Amino acid sequence: SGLVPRGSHMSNKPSKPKTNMKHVAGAAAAGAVVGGLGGYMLGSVMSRPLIHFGNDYEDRYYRENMYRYPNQVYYRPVDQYSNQNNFVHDCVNITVKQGENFTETDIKIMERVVEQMCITQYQRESQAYYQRGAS
């Protein structure tokens, strides 16, 4: 024997509606680059004045090891209430924090080259600020 029972289909739904809207807008654009900081005050590569290590060995060492060192650095605005050594020593920790991978001794000379560079920017800034600054 064999009966012929009718099947039953259950109402199955996805229950997951997606966003829908008809509209178009926008323009084309390209050509942009970023270093990595984009937060601190970084101008443009400036001249790199010699450092005063105190000896002839160190001087020659750096002068010859300048190729393995950066040219620019990152510091904060001197327009803020804070001693110079504050931003000078702080800005130095940033530049070296961006990347070094140098030797154990290099890390030392790297702090001087950067530090001495920070002040060089302020000293020249104070001159222009002495006349006109900003609101």
Curated annotation (Swiss-Prot):
Provide the lipid-modification sites (GPI-anchor amidated alanine). 134
* Cystine pairings recorded for this chain: 91-118
What positions does the record give for glycosylation? 93, 101
Compartmental location: Cell membrane; Golgi apparatus
Summary of the function given for this chain in its UniProt record: Its primary physiological function is unclear. Has cytoprotective activity against internal or environmental stresses. May play a role in neuronal development and synaptic plasticity. May be required for neuronal myelin sheath maintenance. May play a role in iron uptake and iron homeostasis. Soluble oligomers are toxic to cultured neuroblastoma cells and induce apoptosis (in vitro). Association with GPC1 (via its heparan sulfate chains) targets PRNP to lipid rafts. Also provides Cu(2+) or Zn(2+) for the ascorbate-mediated GPC1 deaminase degradation of its heparan sulfate side chains.
Q: How does it assemble?
A: Monomer and homodimer. Has a tendency to aggregate into amyloid fibrils containing a cross-beta spine, formed by a steric zipper of superposed beta-strands. Soluble oligomers may represent an intermediate stage on the path to fibril formation. Copper binding may promote oligomerization. Interacts with GRB2, APP, ERI3/PRNPIP and SYN1. Mislocalized cytosolically exposed PrP interacts with MGRN1; this interaction alters MGRN1 subcellular location and causes lysosomal enlargement. Interacts with KIAA1191.
Provide the domain comment.
The normal, monomeric form has a mainly alpha-helical structure. The disease-associated, protease-resistant form forms amyloid fibrils containing a cross-beta spine, formed by a steric zipper of superposed beta-strands. Disease mutations may favor intermolecular contacts via short beta strands, and may thereby trigger oligomerization. Contains an N-terminal region composed of octamer repeats. At low copper concentrations, the sidechains of His residues from three or four repeats contribute to the binding of a single copper ion. Alternatively, a copper ion can be bound by interaction with the sidechain and backbone amide nitrogen of a single His residue. The observed copper binding stoichiometry suggests that two repeat regions cooperate to stabilize the binding of a single copper ion. At higher copper concentrations, each octamer can bind one copper ion by interactions with the His sidechain and Gly backbone atoms.
Sequence similarity: Belongs to the prion family.
**What other note does the entry give for this protein?**
This protein is produced by a bicistronic gene which also produces the major prion protein/PRNP from an overlapping reading frame.
Involvement in disease:
Found in high quantity in the brain of humans and animals infected with degenerative neurological diseases such as kuru, Creutzfeldt-Jakob disease (CJD), Gerstmann-Straussler syndrome (GSS), scrapie, bovine spongiform encephalopathy (BSE), transmissible mink encephalopathy (TME), etc. Scrapie is a transmissible neurodegenerative disorder of sheep and goats. Most sheep that contract the disease naturally die between 24 and 50 months of age. The incubation period in sheep depends on the strain(s) of the infecting pathogen, sheep age at exposure, and the sheep genotype. Scrapie can be spread between flockmates, or it can be transmitted from an infected ewe to its lamb.
| Record-given protein name | Major prion protein
Q: Which gene encodes it?
A: PRNP
Note the residue range shown relative to the complete protein. 103 to 234 of 256
